[PDB]
C-alpha cells in the first residue's frame, strides 16, 4: 500500500495487478489524465511524435544497413533473375546443422532470408548501385534520425518556445504545408530523380566527385527558361535498350513515349518526374490560398459560414465547423485517418498493374506480400478513423455550439442512417449467399450446368471504353472506329494505357462471373463493417437502452444486467466489434488477388474462371491446393526448403484459437478460481510469508475483449503472412 | 557479504562472462 505510476492516481494505488496492465495502456491517452492542460496535451503530443519521424529513421537506416557488406547487391545489379535476393543473416543457436540447407542461399555465406519488401528495387530503381559506390544509408538517414529527436527536446524546452495557442491556426499552416511541404517536397524529388538517377538508369553513372561537370546534355539547361520545353520529348529512350546501359539509350529527359517491355514492366524512367514536377506547380499554386498576415487570400470561415451549396433556402445551417474541427483534435485525428485510409489502398492497388520498379511483378512475390501490408493497415486504419470520430462526439463535441448545424442533423436524423445502411448489408447478405451455395449445391449434385453465374457487365464495360480492345465490339458511338477520339489520338494514350488483354501482366485482368461475386462480397464488407462503425459512432452519446451513455463515452465496456440485459454497448466495443469485419473484408479482398496472379502466372487462368464461381473449391483448390509446398516442409523426412514459414503458420493457428478464451470467458470464472488458487501459497509451506506486491486478479471486463483480438489478429494476420509467402515461392503459380 | 551497494556489477560482470566467451568460439562446432 504505497504510491507509484507517475501520471494517473486512481490507478496509482490500486493493490492488484491492474495496477500494471492498465498502466501500460493509458500512457498515450494525454487528453484528460492527471498531468494535463490544453497547453500540456497539444505539446505533449507534439514532442511525442517528434519522438516520431525519429523512430522511422532507425528503421530505414538498418534497412539500408543489413545490405552493403552481404545481402547481394553487386550481384542482383548484374541482372535480377527471380532467384532469392536477401534481407539479413539469420543467426539462432537453436538451428541444426541444416544451417547448410537452403537457408544459406546461393551467393552469400551464412543463412539469410531475402528482400520481400520492395526497397531492393528502389534503392536500385533510383540508380544507387556500386558496392564500392554504396555503403551510405544509416550514415545519412541516421545523421538525420537524431536531429529528429533534437527539436523533440529543443521544442520541449520552455524558453525557445514550444508554442501553445499557435497550434490551432490552419490557414498559416496548410497554407504553408500544401506548398512548403508537399510541393517543394515533390519538386526537390523532381530534382533528384532527374539530375542523379534517370542518368543512373538508362544512361551511365554520376561520380561522387562531379555534379557540375556532369550535364545530362552537351549545351546545358539550354533554352528551358526559354519557354520552349517541348523538345525534351523526342528520341527520349528507345526499347532496344538493355536497361541501365545506354545503347539504344538516347538522352532527352521527359516523355510519355514507348511503354511496356518484357525487359522490365514498370513506369517509364522519365514520366514519374515531369509528373512529380507537373503536380509541383498546382500545390505551390494551391499553397498560397489562405491568409498568413500580409493580407491576400482567405479566412477559413466566411467561405464555410454561409458558403453552402445546397443550403441557401433549405433551412439547414453551417455554423463554426472550424472552431469544432479545430477545438476537437479528434475530428482532426480521423479526417487525418482515412484519406490516408482511402489512399493507403489507392497506393497499394495502384502499386500493382502500375508498379514503378526495375523488376517487380515478373517478380510476383514481393509483389504479393506488399499489396497487403497496405491492405492490412489501410483496413486497419479506416476503423481507427471511424473510431476517433466516435470520440469527438463524447470527450469533445457540444450540442449547443453545433446545432441546426450540419454536423448535427447528422446526429438528429440518425435512426435512418443505420437502416438504409443495414438494408444494404442484409440485401448484400443473402443475395451473395444464394449465389455461392446454389453454385455449390449444383456441383456435387452432378450438374455443372444450372450453375447461376452473372457476367460482370458494368465491369468489363469500364475498359471497352479504355483499351480493352478484346475481340472487337462496336458500342453505339465508338464502334472500334468511325468516331474514335477525333479530339484525341497520337498525343497522350500512345502505347500506354494500351496493355489490353496481355496474358502475363496486361494491367486489367479480363473479368467474369467469378469476379461478379467476390466483388459483391468485398461490397457486403465495407457496409456491414461501417453500419457498425457508423452506428458505433452515431451514438457513443447514448440511446433508449443506455440514454445518458457519456462523460466517458468511449470504453466503459459492460453494464449491469437488467434493463433488457446490457453489454458491449460502448462505442469502443462496437469498434471492438467492428475490427472483425475489417479483418474479413481485408481478407476477401486480399484472398482474391492471389488465386488470380497465382494462376495468372506459371500457368492457367481458366482455373479462377469456373472455379471461383462457387465456394467449396475456394477451399479445395486454393486453400487446399497451394499449401502443399510448405507443410510437408517439416516433413517426417527432415527440414526442407521453408521451415520458418510453416511453424509460423501453426504459430498462426495457435495465437488465433487462443484468442477465444479472452472472448468466451468473461472475467467472472477466472477471478473466482484465483480466489481458491490464492488460498494455496498462503496455506502451503516453503511458499509462505513470500508476499506479492500486486493482488492476484482476473482481467478487466474491457481488457479481455481487446487481448482476445490483439491476439485473434496476429495469429490471423501472421497466418496469411506465412501462408502466401510459403506458397508464392515455390509456386507453381 | 559486502552487499553494501552491489548486484549492479555482478549483472555486467557475471553476465558478460556467461555470454562474452560463452558465445564466440575459435572454430565453430557450428549451429
Amino acid at each position: 500500500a504505497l504510491r507509484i505510476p507517475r501520471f494517473s492516481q486512481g490507478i496509482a494505488q490500486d493493490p492488484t495487478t491492474r495496477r500494471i496492465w492498465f498502466g501500460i495502456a493509458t500512457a498515450h491517452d494525454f487528453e484528460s489524465h492527471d498531468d494535463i492542460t490544453e497547453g500540456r496535451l497539444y505539446q505533449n503530443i507534439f514532442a511525442s511524435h517528434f519522438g516520431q519521424l525519429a523512430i522511422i529513421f532507425l528503421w530505414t537506416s538498418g534497412n539500408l544497413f543489413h545490405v552493403a557488406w552481404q545481402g547481394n547487391f553487386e550481384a542482383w545489379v548484374q541482372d535480377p533473375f527471380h532467384v532469392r535476393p536477401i534481407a539479413h543473416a539469420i543467426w539462432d543457436p537453436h538451428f541444426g546443422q541444416p544451417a547448410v540447407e537452403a537457408f544459406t542461399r546461393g551467393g552469400a555465406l551464412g543463412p539469410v532470408n531475402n528482400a520481400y519488401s520492395g526497397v531492393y528495387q528502389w534503392w536500385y530503381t533510383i540508380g544507387l548501385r556500386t558496392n564500392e559506390d554504396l555503403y551510405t544509408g544509416a550514415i545519412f538517414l541516421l545523421f538525420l534520425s537524431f536531429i529528429s529527436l533534437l527539436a523533440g527536446w529543443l521544442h520541449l524546452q520552455p524558453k525557445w518556445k514550444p508554442s501553445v495557442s499557435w497550434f490551432k491556426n490552419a490557414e498559416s499552416r496548410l497554407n504553408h504545408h500544401l506548398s512548403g511541404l508537399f510541393g517543394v517536397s515533390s519538386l526537390a524529388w523532381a530534382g533528384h530523380l532527374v539530375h542523379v538517377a534517370i542518368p543512373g538508369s538508362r544512361g551511365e553513372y554520376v561520380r561522387w566527385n562531379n555534379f557540375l561537370d556532369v550535364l545530362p546534355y552537351p549545351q546545358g539547361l539550354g533554352p528551358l527558361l526559354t519557354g520552349q520545353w517541348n523538345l525534351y520529348a523526342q528520341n527520349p529512350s528507345s526499347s532496344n535498350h538493355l536497361f541501365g546501359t545506354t545503347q539504344g539509350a538516347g538522352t532527352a529527359i521527359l516523355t510519355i513515349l514507348g511503354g511496356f517491355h518484357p525487359q522490365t514492366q514498370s513506369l517509364w524512367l522519365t514520366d514519374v518526374a515531369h509528373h512529380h514536377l507537373a503536380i509541383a506547380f498546382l500545390f505551390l499554386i494551391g499553397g498560397l490560398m489562405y491568409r498568413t498576415n500580409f493580407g491576400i487570400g482567405h479566412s477559413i470561415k466566411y467561405i464555410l459560414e454561409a458558403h453552402i451549396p445546397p443550403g441557401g433556402r433549405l433551412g439547414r445551417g453551417h455554423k463554426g465547423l472550424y472552431d469544432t474541427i479545430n477545438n476537437s483534435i479528434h475530428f482532426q485525428l480521423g479526417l487525418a485517418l482515412a484519406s490516408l485510409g482511402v489512399i493507403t489502398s489507392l497506393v497499394a492497388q495502384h502499386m500493382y498493374s502500375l508498379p514503378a520498379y526495375a523488376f517487380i511483378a515478373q517478380d510476383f512475390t514481393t509483389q504479393a506480400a506488399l499489396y497487403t501490408h497496405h491492405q492490412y493497415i489501410a483496413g486497419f486504419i479506416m476503423t481507427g478513423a471511424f473510431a476517433h470520430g466516435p470520440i469527438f462526439f463524447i470527450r469533445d463535441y457540444n450540442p449547443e455550439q453545433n446545432a441546426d448545424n450540419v454536423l448535427a442533423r447528422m446526429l438528429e436524423h440518425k435512426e435512418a442512417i443505420i437502416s438504409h445502411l443495414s438494408w444494404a448489408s442484409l440485401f448484400l447478405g443473402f443475395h451473395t449467399l444464394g449465389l455461392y451455395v446454389h453454385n455449390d449445391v449444383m456441383l456435387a449434385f452432378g450438374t455443372p450446368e444450372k450453375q447461376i453465374l452473372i457476367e460482370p457487365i458494368f465491369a468489363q464495360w469500364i475498359q471497352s471504353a479504355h483499351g480493352k480492345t478484346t475481340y472487337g465490339f462496336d458500342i453505339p458511338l465508338s464502334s472500334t472506329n468511325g468516331p474514335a477520339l477525333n479530339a484525341g489520338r497520337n498525343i497522350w494514350l500512345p502505347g500506354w494505357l494500351n496493355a489490353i488483354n496481355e496474358n502475363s501482366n496486361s494491367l486489367f485482368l479480363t473479368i467474369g462471373p467469378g469476379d461478379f461475386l467476390v466483388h459483391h462480397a468485398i461490397a457486403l464488407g465495407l457496409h456491414t463493417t461501417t453500419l457498425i462503425l457508423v452506428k458505433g459512432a452515431l451514438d457513443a452519446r447514448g440511446s433508449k437502452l443506455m440514454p445518458d451513455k457519456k462523460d466517458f463515452g468511449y470504453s466503459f465496456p459492460c453494464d449491469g444486467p437488467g434493463r433488457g440485459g446490457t453489454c458491449d454497448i460502448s462505442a469502443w466495443d462496437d469498434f471492438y466489434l467492428a475490427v472483425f469485419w475489417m479483418l474479413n473484408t481485408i481478407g476477401w479482398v486480399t484472398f482474391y488477388w492471389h488465386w488470380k496472379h497465382i494462376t495468372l502466372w506459371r500457368g492457367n487462368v481458366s482455373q479462377f474462371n469456373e472455379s471461383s464461381t462457387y465456394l467449396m473449391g475456394w477451399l479445395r483448390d486454393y486453400l487446399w491446393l497451394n499449401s502443399s509446398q510448405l507443410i510437408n516442409g517439416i516433413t517426417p523426412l527432415v527440414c526442407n526448403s521453408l521451415s520458418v514459414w510453416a511453424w509460423m503458420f501453426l504459430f498462426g493457428h495457435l495465437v488465433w484459437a487462443t484468442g477465444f478464451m479472452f472472448l468466451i470467458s468473461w472475467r467472472g470464472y477466472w477471478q473466482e478460481l484465483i480466489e481458491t488458487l490464492a488460498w494455496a501459497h498462503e496455506r502451503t509451506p516453503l511458499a509462505n510469508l513470500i508476499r506479492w506486491r500486486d493482488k492476484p486478479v482476473a482481467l478487466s471486463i474491457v481488457q479481455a475483449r481487446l487481448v482476445g483480438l490483439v491476439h485473434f489478429s496476429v495469429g490471423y494476420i501472421f497466418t496469411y503472412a506465412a501462408f502466401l509467402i510459403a506458397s508464392t515461392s515455390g509456386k507453381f503459380g | 557479504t559486502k552487499r553494501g551497494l552491489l548486484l549492479k556489477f555482478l549483472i555486467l560482470g557475471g553476465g558478460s562472462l556467461l555470454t562474452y566467451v560463452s558465445a564466440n568460439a575459435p572454430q565453430d562446432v557450428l549451429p
Binding site: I4 | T19, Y20, A23, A25
Partner: peptide, 30 residues
C-alpha cells in the same frame, strides 16, 4: 583469429532483456 561476430544477440535478445525485467521491476519498486 577467424570467425567470431556473435555478441549482438545475447547483449540484445538476452542481456538487454535481463536489464529491463530487472531494472523495470521499478514498476513494482526501485
Amino acid at each position: 583469429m577467424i570467425n567470431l561476430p556473435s555478441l549482438f544477440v545475447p547483449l540484445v535478445g538476452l542481456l538487454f532483456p535481463a536489464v529491463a525485467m530487472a531494472s523495470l521491476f521499478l514498476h513494482v519498486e526501485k
